[PDB]
Design a protein around this nucleic acid. Structure first.
Ligand SMILES: [Mg+2]
Lengths: 169, 190, 67, 79, 97, 135, 254, 237
RNA sequence: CGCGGGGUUAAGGUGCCGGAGUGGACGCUCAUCAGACACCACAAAAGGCGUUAGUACAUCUUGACAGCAGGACGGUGGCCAUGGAAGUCGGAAUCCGCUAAGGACUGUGUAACAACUCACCUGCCGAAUGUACUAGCCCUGAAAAUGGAUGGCGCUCAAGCGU
RNA sequence: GGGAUGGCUUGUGGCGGCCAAGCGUUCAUAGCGACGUCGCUUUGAUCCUUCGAUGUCGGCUCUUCCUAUCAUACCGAAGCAGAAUUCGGUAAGCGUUGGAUUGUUCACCCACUAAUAGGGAACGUGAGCUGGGUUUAGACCGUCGUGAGACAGGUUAGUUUUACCCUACUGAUGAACUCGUCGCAAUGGUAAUUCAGCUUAGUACGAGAGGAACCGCUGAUUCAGAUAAUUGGUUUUU
């Protein structure tokens, strides 16, 4: 049977449910700053809090790196750089003078060579056997995630002959 | 709307004979004689004036009235063909392999035959047979030019189109490979 | 008549003149009539007529109409 | 297309009773739904429709306008 | 549902039905097209199959690997005593053949 | 260019996929296991098979360890299944054997032990130049 | 070798049309509501997976066909920086890779939802949602695809210069006879005209001296102003002078 | 060849002798060709052609109207906000969607069968709509898990629009407040159309009149997540 | 709605199957599987250089639409920018003169110019046109899988459609 | 004792805002609204985030059909120089293959190749054979239950066995027209396919690296129809 799916008018729909003060935010930020990790303490119930307002921001180099591409596209669009209607006349260079260019070319040749010997140091080959794909099946990993969703305590078992080898990071 | 009466007029030159019977138009002049069967088009032919042929359509639609202009142009082209003739000049150009064009006349059939060799170095010999009444000559005033002359404009232009289409470049960039035989001039013999 | 030639629309600055150009020519001729002693009629038949600009520049005291 | 030399499977113009009955039922449901939507329709409608008037190619439109002027003048004089 | 792996059909439907022939002697279904400008000649003959044997042929086939070389080929012998001509049949063309 | 050679007459194929032949060169391999034949057609259930003069794809089942993990082109130089040449001669060798080559036909090894077939020698000029007996 | 083997780069609309036409035509399209729910789920899951696989093939071909600037010789890397603005080059290819990853993620999510859909209508709505989101992602790539197609055409027409061979590098001011010298010594078709900067790109020809192959590089002219004032046309010549170990022939018109 | 070699070839040797006249004839035949395409194409190709021709006609009419009309921000913002991309920006405490379609329990729950016999036990029910399970969630063990909320149908974030600010931000779901069809659906946390949910509005920068930061508010789901694959919500402000 | 004979009709029909008209009047339509029992869906303010009938606005012997022969100029290579950029890679302005008319330019073109071309104007010719909508009929407006269906033959100034 | 959604579907997301040709309205200036557009859903990276079976498929063997075309044939376009391609159009005539992996949604890999295209005729319940969903009776192990037993489950072993009937199909005879010989041909069926090599030619084209095609010639792949000189195989030639 189909019910009447209706919502009553109520003043509670247009009010704030959770509020926080600036002093409480400062206290939680200080607690987040001085928080430490202890292996012998477990987490039983998380506190519902604005983590976006409590935790610290990212690093400045990451903040610039996440916007460098968009910033370059905003500075020069693709159509003004290359194409029939391009207006780009001056290239972007990592050097200013001829001496800097000579030193840069020498360093670039050295780095190109060193990458070449590193790649050198690092008929078609026979295909890898399907026996070495065991443990990566979708059914097996469905089983793993089902067990993880069902369990409170997870015993991760490590072979003593190779603990870091058998660890599942 | 059906138009009650529509008419067209074709002037005839002094040295031109026109005979129409059962919509079979025969036009004779100094250069020869041509025929065309126009029985697929409903038209009444008459002699409205000395040296003027009248074409009439009665109770016709817009399509039937418009067909008379095509009939007029066809008969005028026959008249021009038997009076002055038609001439198509074609040029063949090449980059590396010179195109060899040989023109012969088949005695049994009475038609001209054009053989094309060394088109972009190909070993095959292309052979195209002209429509009867069309003469092909290799020009002497200009370099690498054929001249197709006749009394039938349709026959001359179709022979030129066949020669143009037999030398088609396939699976090559046409911006780079410019080889072929093209119609360079159209006009009258006289 | 569904089968018809599609008229091109011109995305150009200059429009067709119309009747106001004719009225302007009427007014210009009728206002230049009383100011001058003589009115010549001249013909330039089958000529390019781009040297009428030079003729107008040379005869700056005269008025030339070529409508 | 190579329709003339190699025609495909024909499309049948012969109807079935089931499809005829279904189409009739859907047509009746659609006209009832249009009646309900026209009743519930909040679109504005004028009390008087916009009359198109007298055609320009009617040769006596000028005399019709003369008659309309004369009738309106006579009505104003009578009233 | 469709067949998972494609394979051409067994046998040719051009040679149907696979029944016994209606006559022991073979039938010329089509004689060569006649050209009146050629001299008169006979288009067919009879023989009796005797058997098979082996030859060695000196091959003149330009472009082939066995050009100017000896090849061994199987051949069939047909015994052909001379025929005797005993009759003449005339045929006309009708709208039924 | 794929490895199937042109100008080859029809002969009896004696080595299908899964056959192990001897290795007739000195590249270090002792046997060759056929996994594919170059130029093989498409037919339901049919094993691809090669003959003398044909290029196959082969793994090495015993020999040097550096050749065991790669798939090599090889040319069959001897087969044990009898076959007929155009001179009417039916013939066979006492074993099946081939030599490892590159796709262009040049051999990996430097010498050939035993004879090679006439078909293989005529189709591959490097094998004909490295053969001691053409047979 | 060169970079002529890069496949053509379509626009966003052409990409969308190609992918959706492949999905429409290379797969069956007729499914019935009266069929089994497993059959319906298989139909729409196959549609979504095939659309994603076509997008992945095209994007991976684009990524693996273009040169990797970090793996080039410094001459080629700096020449591509001069010609195509390496920053814009890397940004466009990164946008292509990010769109490929996002399309794969959307396909995984909607296949997971199609596992639990319960009717043909819900399955159809989920399939249309997946393909519409992929189309939106492709529509957000309008400028990089045009830029990459132009870069691909220029790279295909780029000359092949070996940086580790015998090279005669001709340089100098414009209108001093560099192209005339290169035309005299090699078979390269570089134009000779009396106006400045007739040659606007690197040209290369080849000669034979003592049974050895030599390459000769004709360059655009260089003017007397610093590197911050040099434009791209002269910086091609400057890159060639900086990064190619060659014999420099500096031409002077006295 | 190198650089603009086709352009150099066109300069040195020209083009084919019939190229200009054949291009002119093809451009002249375009009208007949377009009519033939309009009257002769079939199916999806015809539908796409008709739609794209409709788009061309609309764009051409707009261009002609602009060429006719050649011969003839909204909200006050400061100087530092000028030339930027700014949003357009457009008692009874009723929600925007007071009534939605009701969902029956057979549509909500499908029977999960268990057992090895031909006859199966059918006490388990699986939720066929998207759900929100909340933080610190551990599934009940299978012997006592009557209601199955699969992991593939669990959502944690939603695209929430502020009606006044005219912005759409992806926000974390805090809790499910009221499913309009059933309190059992509310308890299970089903996300369907018309559902009132609690959302984290920290990214929206809402400050109360007393100076506190409001980081939790109410939104109404305006879409069908089981059909769309995403949750769309509008703030109740 | 009893069993029969005669007469007359209803719905539906009158080219043949099939009893009854290749009936009469005026028009429309040609479909590369038209249409003939349609209204629903596909389907939209949809696409048609198919064919008619209309409505509104506009031009026209002071010469309309189409063409052909010619002009299409001067300040001026307008400002900034660019290695170069002169209407025609770009950014922004876009005025005046001579005017019959001619854009600080519609495209082709040059490295840049040059050159050609379009808008607009004049001469020749000669009488009706142009645009946008509306209503009819026609085509497209999405289709799978054995060989088939306006019931079948077939039908084109119909044996289709409206009265 | 009963019983065993359908002229559906296909290629382009949802929510919210704005613009909008048009529809209406012009005693109210509201309301519908295509085409669009804007917000939410890595500098070619990461690889230390795989998110639940109530819904069951397969395999041979063989035939046919559709086109929504992978290849082959032809054609249009693209900086398409050549070579190799890419997008698109007509086209179902002809092909579209071995093989590995059952700790498992058997789906993905490797190779050969011209290419290894996708579907229907079952899955809108359903007697050819044969493995999985799969499940009578025997048996352990796990979970639940005091227990009989039931399941979140995992494992092992296990009975359906025509055809001589009508029709269809494949072949084989045949009465009546004296027997026989030579024929005709309505109608039905219909068949070939792809690659490689030589030459063209190291030529056209190209800075170089490289690098075609038409005509001509010779083989091979798949299919088809025959045959037994030879080579193998088969031996109750007992
Ligand atoms: Mg110069």
């Amino acid at each position: 049977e189909v019910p009447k799916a209706v919502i009553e008018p109520n003043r509670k729909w247009f009010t704030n449910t959770r509020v926080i003060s600036q002093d409480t935010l400062q206290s939680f930020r200080e607690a987040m700053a001085e928080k430490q990790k202890d292996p012998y303490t477990v987490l039983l119930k998380s506190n519902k809090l604005p983590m976006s307002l409590i935790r610290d921001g990212p690093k400045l180099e990451d903040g610039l790196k996440k916007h460098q591409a968009k910033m370059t596209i905003e500075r020069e669009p693709f159509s003004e750089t290359f194409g029939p209607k391009a207006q780009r006349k001056r290239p972007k260079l990592s050097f200013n003078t001829v001496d800097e260019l000579a030193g840069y070319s020498e360093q670039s040749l050295d780095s190109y060579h060193a990458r070449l010997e590193e790649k050198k140091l690092l008929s078609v080959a026979t295909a890898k056997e399907a026996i070495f794909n065991k443990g990566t099946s979708k059914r097996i990993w469905n089983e793993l995630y089902k067990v993880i969703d069902s369990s409170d305590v997870i015993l991760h078992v490590l072979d003593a002959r190779d603990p870091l080898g058998t660890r599942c990071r | 709307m059906r138009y009650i009466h529509s008419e067209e007029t074709i002037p005839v030159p002094e040295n031109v004979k026109v005979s129409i019977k059962s919509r079979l138009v025969t036009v004779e002049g100094p250069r020869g004689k041509l025929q065309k069967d126009l029985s697929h088009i409903a038209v009444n032919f008459s002699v409205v004036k000395k040296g003027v042929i009248g074409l009439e359509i009665h109770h016709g639609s817009r399509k039937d009235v418009a067909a008379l202009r095509t009939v007029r142009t066809i008969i005028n082209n026959m008249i021009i063909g038997v009076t002055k003739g038609f001439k198509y000049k074609m040029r063949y150009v090449y980059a590396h392999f010179p195109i060899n064009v040989n023109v012969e006349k088949n005695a049994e059939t009475g038609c001209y035959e054009v053989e094309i060799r060394n088109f972009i170095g190909e070993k095959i010999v292309r052979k195209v047979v002209m429509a009867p009444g069309v003469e092909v000559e290799i020009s002497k005033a200009q370099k690498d030019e054929l001249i197709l002359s006749g009394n039938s404009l349709e026959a001359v232009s179709q022979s030129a189109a066949d020669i143009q289409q037999i030398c088609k470049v396939r699976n090559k960039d046409i911006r780079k490979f410019l080889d072929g035989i093209y119609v360079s001039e159209k006009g009258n013999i006289v | 008549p569904k089968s018809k030639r599609a008229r091109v629309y011109h995305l150009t600055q200059v429009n067709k003149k119309g009747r106001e150009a004719k009225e302007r020519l009427f007014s210009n001729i009728r206002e230049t009539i009383p100011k001058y002693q003589h009115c010549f009629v001249f013909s330039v038949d089958n000529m390019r007529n781009n040297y009428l600009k030079d003729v107008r520049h040379e005869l700056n005291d005269c008025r030339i109409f070529f409508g | 297309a190579g329709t003339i030399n190699k025609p495909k499977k024909p499309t049948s113009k012969r109807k079935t009773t089931r499809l005829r009955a279904k189409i009739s039922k859907r047509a009746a449901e659609k006209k009832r739904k249009e009646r309900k939507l026209a009743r519930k329709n909040p679109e504005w409608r004028s009390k008087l429709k916009k009359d198109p008037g007298i055609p320009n190619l009617f040769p006596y439109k000028e005399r019709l306008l003369q008659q309309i002027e004369e009738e309106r003048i006579r009505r104003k004089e009578e009233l | 549902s469709h067949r998972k792996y494609e394979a051409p059909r067994h046998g040719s439907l051009a040679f149907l039905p696979r029944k016994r022939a209606a006559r022991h002697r073979g039938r010329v279904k089509s004689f060569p097209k006649d050209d009146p400008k050629k001299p008169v000649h006979l288009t067919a003959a009879m023989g009796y199959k005797a058997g098979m044997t082996t030859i060695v042929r000196d091959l003149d086939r330009p472009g082939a690997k066995a050009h100017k070389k000896e090849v061994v080929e199987a051949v069939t012998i047909i015994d052909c005593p001379p025929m005797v001509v005993v009759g003449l049949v005339g045929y006309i063309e009708t709208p039924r053949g | 260019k794929r490895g199937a050679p042109g100008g080859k007459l029809k002969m009896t194929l004696g080595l299908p996929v899964g056959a192990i032949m001897n290795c007739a060169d000195n590249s270090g391999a002792r046997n060759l296991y056929i996994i594919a034949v170059k130029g093989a057609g498409a037919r339901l259930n049919r094993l691809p098979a090669g003959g003398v003069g044909d290029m196959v794809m082969a793994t090495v089942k015993k020999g040097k360890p550096e050749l065991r993990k790669k798939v090599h082109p090889a040319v069959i130089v001897r087969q044990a299944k009898p076959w007929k040449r155009f001179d009417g001669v039916f013939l066979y060798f006492e074993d099946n054997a081939g030599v490892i080559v590159n796709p262009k036909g040049e051999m990996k090894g430097s010498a050939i032990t035993g004879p090679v077939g006439k078909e293989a020698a005529e189709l591959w000029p490097r094998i004909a130049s490295n053969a001691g007996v053409v047979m | 070798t060169g970079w002529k083997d890069i496949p053509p780069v379509p626009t966003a609309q052409e990409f969308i049309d190609i992918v959706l036409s492949r999905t429409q035509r290379r797969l069956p399209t007729q499914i019935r509501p009266g069929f089994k729910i497993s059959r319906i789920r298989a139909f729409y899951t196959r549609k979504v997976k095939f659309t994603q696989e076509t997008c992945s093939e095209k994007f991976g071909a684009i990524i693996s066909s273009f040169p990797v600037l970090s793996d080039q010789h410094p001459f080629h890397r700096d020449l591509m920086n001069i010609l195509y603005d390496a920053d814009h080059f890397k940004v466009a290819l990164g946008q292509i890779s990010t769109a490929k990853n996002l399309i794969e993620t959307i396909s995984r999510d909607y296949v997971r939802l199609l596992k639990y859909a319960q009717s043909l209508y819900q399955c159809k709505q989920l399939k249309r949602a997946a393909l519409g989101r992929m189309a939106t992602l492709i529509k957000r790539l309008k400028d990089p695809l045009i830029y990459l197609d132009q870069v691909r055409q220029h790279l295909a027409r780029l000359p092949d210069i070996n940086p580790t061979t015998r090279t005669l590098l001709v340089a100098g001011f414009p209108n001093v006879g560099k192209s005339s010298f290169v035309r005299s010594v090699t078979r390269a078709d570089t134009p000779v005209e009396p106006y400045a900067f007739t040659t606007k790109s690197l040209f290369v020809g080849h000669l034979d001296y003592k049974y050895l192959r030599y390459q000769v590089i004709d360059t655009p002219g260089i003017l007397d102003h610093p590197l911050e004032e040099m434009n791209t046309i002269e910086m091609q010549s400057v890159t060639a002078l900086a990064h190619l170990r060659a014999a420099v022939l500096y031409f002077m018109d006295i | 060849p190198q650089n603009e070699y086709i352009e150099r070839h066109r300069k040195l040797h020209g083009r084919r002798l019939d190229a200009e006249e054949r291009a002119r004839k093809k451009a002249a035949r375009e009208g007949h060709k377009n009519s033939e395409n309009a009257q002769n194409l079939r199916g999806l190709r015809a539908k796409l052609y008709a739609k794209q021709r409709h788009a061309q006609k609309i764009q051409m009419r707009k261009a002609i109207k602009q060429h006719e009309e050649r011969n003839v921000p909204s909200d006050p913002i400061p100087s530092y906000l000028l030339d930027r991309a700014n949003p357009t920006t457009a008692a009874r405490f009723s929600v925007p969607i007071p009534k939605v379609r009701g969902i029956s329990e057979e549509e909500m729950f499908k029977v999960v069968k268990t057992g090895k016999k031909t006859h199966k036990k059918g006490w388990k029910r699986i939720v066929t709509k998207p759900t929100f399970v909340g933080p610190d969630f551990t599934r009940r063990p299978v012997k006592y898990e009557r209601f199955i909320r699969p992991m593939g149908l669990r959502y944690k974030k939603a695209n929430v629009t502020h009606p006044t600010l005219n912005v759409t931000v992806q926000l974390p779901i805090l809790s499910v407040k009221k499913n309009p069809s059933n309190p059992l659906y509310t308890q299970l946390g089903v996300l369907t159309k018309g559902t009132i949910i609690e959302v984290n509005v920290s990214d929206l920068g809402i400050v109360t009149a007393s100076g506190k930061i409001a980081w939790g508010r109410y939104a109404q789901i305006t879409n069908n997540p089981e059909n769309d694959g995403c949750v769309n919500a509008v703030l109740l402000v």
